[PDB]
Design an enzyme around this catalytic site. Structure first.
Site, short mmCIF file in Angstrom:
data_model
loop_
_atom_site.label_atom_id
_atom_site.label_comp_id
_atom_site.label_asym_id
_atom_site.label_seq_id
_atom_site.Cartn_x
_atom_site.Cartn_y
_atom_site.Cartn_z
N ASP A 46 55.60 54.18 9.91
CA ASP A 46 55.88 53.69 8.55
C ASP A 46 56.59 52.35 8.57
O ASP A 46 57.72 52.23 9.05
CB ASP A 46 56.75 54.69 7.76
CG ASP A 46 56.95 54.25 6.31
OD1 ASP A 46 55.96 54.34 5.53
OD2 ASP A 46 58.09 53.83 5.93
N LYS A 80 53.77 48.39 3.01
CA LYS A 80 54.09 48.46 1.59
C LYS A 80 54.17 47.07 0.92
O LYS A 80 54.67 46.13 1.50
CB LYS A 80 55.42 49.21 1.36
CG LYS A 80 55.54 50.56 2.07
CD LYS A 80 56.90 51.22 1.87
CE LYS A 80 57.11 52.40 2.80
NZ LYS A 80 57.82 52.04 4.06
N1 LIG Z 1 61.48 53.37 -0.74
C1 LIG Z 1 60.87 53.78 0.37
O1 LIG Z 1 59.63 53.94 0.44
C2 LIG Z 1 61.73 54.18 1.53
C3 LIG Z 1 63.11 54.26 1.44
C4 LIG Z 1 63.86 54.73 2.51
C5 LIG Z 1 63.22 55.09 3.68
N2 LIG Z 1 61.89 54.99 3.80
C6 LIG Z 1 61.11 55.26 5.10
O2 LIG Z 1 61.56 56.50 5.63
C7 LIG Z 1 62.18 56.30 6.92
C8 LIG Z 1 63.24 57.35 7.16
O3 LIG Z 1 64.29 57.22 6.17
P1 LIG Z 1 65.68 56.50 6.45
O4 LIG Z 1 65.51 55.44 7.47
O5 LIG Z 1 66.33 56.19 5.16
O6 LIG Z 1 66.50 57.70 7.11
P2 LIG Z 1 66.57 59.03 7.81
O7 LIG Z 1 65.31 59.05 8.73
O8 LIG Z 1 66.80 60.27 7.01
O9 LIG Z 1 67.74 58.90 8.95
C9 LIG Z 1 67.81 57.83 9.92
C10 LIG Z 1 69.15 57.96 10.60
O10 LIG Z 1 69.26 59.24 11.26
C11 LIG Z 1 69.61 59.06 12.62
N3 LIG Z 1 68.90 60.04 13.42
C12 LIG Z 1 67.55 60.04 13.69
N4 LIG Z 1 67.14 61.07 14.38
C13 LIG Z 1 68.31 61.79 14.60
C14 LIG Z 1 68.55 63.00 15.29
N5 LIG Z 1 67.60 63.70 15.92
N6 LIG Z 1 69.83 63.45 15.33
C15 LIG Z 1 70.78 62.73 14.74
N7 LIG Z 1 70.67 61.57 14.07
C16 LIG Z 1 69.39 61.17 14.03
C17 LIG Z 1 69.15 57.65 12.96
O11 LIG Z 1 69.90 57.15 14.09
P3 LIG Z 1 69.48 56.06 15.21
O12 LIG Z 1 68.27 55.34 14.61
O13 LIG Z 1 70.52 55.13 15.64
O14 LIG Z 1 69.00 57.04 16.27
C18 LIG Z 1 69.47 56.91 11.66
O15 LIG Z 1 70.85 56.58 11.60
C19 LIG Z 1 62.65 54.85 6.88
O16 LIG Z 1 62.93 54.31 8.16
C20 LIG Z 1 61.49 54.18 6.16
O17 LIG Z 1 60.36 53.97 7.00
C21 LIG Z 1 61.13 54.55 2.72
#
Ligand SMILES: NC(=O)c1ccc[n+]([C@@H]2O[C@H](COP(=O)([O-])OP(=O)(O)OC[C@H]3O[C@@H](n4cnc5c(N)ncnc54)[C@H](OP(=O)(O)O)[C@@H]3O)[C@@H](O)[C@H]2O)c1
Ligand SMILES: CC(=C\c1ccccc1)/C=C1/SC(=S)N(CC(=O)O)C1=O
Length: 318
Positions: A46, A80
């Protein structure tokens, strides 16, 4: 070696139910993260123009292909369109920049990132004299029309939306001369925000859902200590240990069992591998009901409080 289940889209294309999130993945880290994910078995990445790391994601993809670690046809790359580019000539320009950075000749899915159009120009986040978002000339229906042309020309395989409510999806589906339907709606989803009605609606229209921030986005800049914290939820952790899994793995599995695509982000190699090790256990019906009951209607990612603009998605119930 790992393989995520396929969720079939309305185009018959197959979308891996687990993909790699890349938001907040820094340059100097995301290349290796994508390399690790691909080696581990991820085929769904993504991306987004606004994350400004696509060229580094592009390098890792190219090098793995040259290496013969993976074929393009088996990768599933999503990016996107950002709302400052809703105007037709800008759609093609932003799209082209994304496609060049990624070093691809086609994208599998291209999403409207956010439904509200913003002022075009050099700023990605145009605000006025207060920190108020300034709207743009083109609507998301305008942007879609230009996006449909990308599909006609073989540059993108399918279109989708992100952060749309069901009203906005209704508006898209009812548009005169609609050429392509969205194959997915990418929205925040996790046990504190279960999206029961949004998911029910999207599914009833043959639109899949992609769950973002499934771990509760702990690294989001505006995170406050008192903010609810999914990865530390003792009830989540207790369901985890019963399956000899981590909390992150339960949180990921939760979406899988509702048939929702899920895209956890990590730049840590051990976590990237751990996050796709979620096809060797099953949450019981009871456990699913308990997790569903944790819904708090809490949005981790809601820094945009541009409710003054038309098409603010989060005023609607769903
Ligand atoms: N508007 C939109 O369309 C939108 C908005 C937000 C997000 N997204 C997409 O969704 C993805 C995921 O959402 P997000 O980045 O907001 O957050 P999220 O995936 O819920 O969490 C990411 C965080 O969790 C940590 N983490 C990952 N795996 C882990 C594990 N097994 N144990 C403990 N901690 C862990 C990561 O740490 P480290 O990376 O340091 O390991 C990072 O700090 C984004 O990267 C993006 O591609 C889209
Ligand atoms: C404040 C700027 C925004 S708007 C938005 S959506 N996101 C998350 C994302 O881009 O995926 C932001 O960080």
């Amino acid at each position: 070696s790992h393989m995520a289940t396929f969720v079939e889209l309305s185009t018959k294309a197959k979308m891996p139910i687990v993909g790699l999130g890349t938001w907040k993945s820094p340059l100097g880290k995301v290349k290796e993260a994508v390399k690790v994910a691909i080696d581990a078995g991820y085929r769904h990445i993504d991306c987004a123009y606004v994350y400004q790391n696509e060229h580094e994601v592009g390098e890792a993809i190219q090098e793995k292909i040259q290496e013969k670690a993976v074929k393009r046809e088996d990768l599933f790359i999503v990016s996107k369109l950002w709302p400052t580019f809703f105007e037709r000539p800008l759609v093609r320009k932003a799209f082209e920049k994304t496609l060049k950075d990624l070093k691809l000749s086609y994208l599998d899915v291209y999403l409207i990132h956010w439904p509200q159009g913003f002022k075009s120009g050099d700023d990605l986040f145009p605000k006025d004299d207060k920190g108020n978002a300034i709207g743009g000339k083109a609507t998301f229906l305008d942007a879609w029309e230009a996006m449909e042309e990308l599909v006609d020309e073989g540059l993108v395989k399918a279109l989708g939306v992100s952060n749309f409510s069901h009203f906005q999806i209704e508006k898209l589906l009812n548009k005169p001369g609609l050429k392509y339907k969205p194959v997915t709606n990418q929205v925040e989803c996790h046990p504190y925000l279960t999206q029961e009605k949004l998911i029910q609606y999207c599914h009833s229209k043959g639109i899949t859902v992609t769950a973002y921030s499934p771990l509760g986005s702990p690294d989001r800049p505006w995170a406050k200590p008192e903010d609810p914290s999914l990865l530390e939820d003792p009830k989540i952790k207790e369901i985890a240990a019963k399956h000899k899994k981590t909390a992150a793995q339960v949180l990921i599995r939760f979406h899988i069992q509702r048939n929702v695509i899920v895209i956890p982000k990590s730049v840590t190699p051990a976590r990237i591998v751990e996050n796709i090790q979620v096809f060797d256990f099953k949450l019981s019906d009871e456990e699913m009901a308990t997790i569903l009951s944790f819904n708090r209607n809490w949005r981790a990612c809601n820094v945009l409080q541009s409710s003054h603009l038309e098409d603010y998605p989060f005023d609607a119930e769903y």
